[PDB]
Design a protein around this ligand. Structure first.
Ligand SMILES: *[C@@H]1O[C@H](CO[C@@H]2O[C@@H](C)[C@@H](O)[C@@H](O)[C@@H]2O)[C@@H](O[C@@H]2O[C@@H](C)[C@@H](O)[C@@H](O)[C@@H]2O)[C@H](O[C@@H]2O[C@@H](C)[C@@H](O)[C@@H](O)[C@@H]2O)[C@H]1NC(C)=O
Ligand code: PAM
Ligand code: PAM
Lengths: 119, 121
């Protein structure tokens, strides 16, 4: 079933409801939220206007009551966030996370049946 | 008085390095100011708005310029972005958007050419 998002940084990004487990197999929003919290300095610095939405689209993925297919962000969302933010991360010794590699995400409109989220 | 370097930890590295006491809250010291603005620190880590830190610091540790010799407020638009981002969460958690940082107390950028204000990013 769908639950109201309780991860504070992921409220106000365009949708209200999520469902667990997410694609990292976090079992609760609490677990997901403790991890995504670590990205707050990157979000504050605004290296990319897509980052916040992108992070939330994976940590608290959108839930629709009638839809049971997973709705990842589109690859393009990831690409923009990565292009904006990875240089700054690299500058702090952080590589772009392995679990966030964009090639794992569907391309917008490539497959009619495979929907995804574009900001 | 007096153009002093900013010591409040939250407000270091926000884009200007100097402030002046007292502020609009009648804090006589940065230590007094810091104790209050640091109560908002969890909201900064929550990142309901990227503009929140700058907006708060522009109030509590206002910019001091050796060339202006008067207070320089954030533009209304800075407040409006912080508030649009963070008011919903503050209201949900039971904390009203405080009246001291009402956006209608701030100048709209360029509405009167002689009334300056700081915008950012
Ligand atoms: C997204 O959620 C908004 C907040 O809902 C409230 O908080 C959540 C966490 C739950 O506890 C809900 O049970 C609460 O209603 C919701 O907006 C609210 O709507 C009214 C009742 C009032 O509380 C407002 O202050 C809230 O913002 C959103 O609902 C949409 O937008 C609002 C502005 C109205 O127009 C609604 O009709 C809309 O559906 C909701 N968004 C969606 C798409 O459901
Ligand atoms: C911890 C407070 C840092 C504040 C300074 C602002 C600089 C931010 C850029 C560095 C981002 C920190 C890494 C976040 C990503 C991660 O932890 O995996
Ligand atoms: C970082 C330690 C505290 C973590 C506890 C989480 C609390 C979150 C409350 C959200 C922000 C509250 C804003 C208070 C504003 C005010 O003091 O008027």
């Amino acid at each position: 079933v769908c639950q109201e998002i309780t991860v504070p940084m992921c409220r106000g990004i365009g949708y209200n409801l999520t469902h667990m487990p997410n694609q990292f197999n976090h079992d609760t929003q609490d677990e997901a939220g403790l991890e995504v919290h670590q990205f707050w300095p990157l979000v504050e610095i605004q290296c990319s206007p897509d980052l916040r939405f992108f992070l939330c689209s994976m940590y608290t993925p959108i839930c629709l009551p009638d839809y049971h297919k997973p709705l990842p962000p589109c690859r393009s969302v990831c690409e923009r966030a990565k292009a904006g933010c990875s240089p700054l991360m690299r500058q702090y010794g952080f590589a772009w996370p392995e679990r966030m590699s964009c090639d794992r995400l569907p391309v917008l409109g490539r497959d009619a049946e495979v929907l995804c989220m574009d900001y």
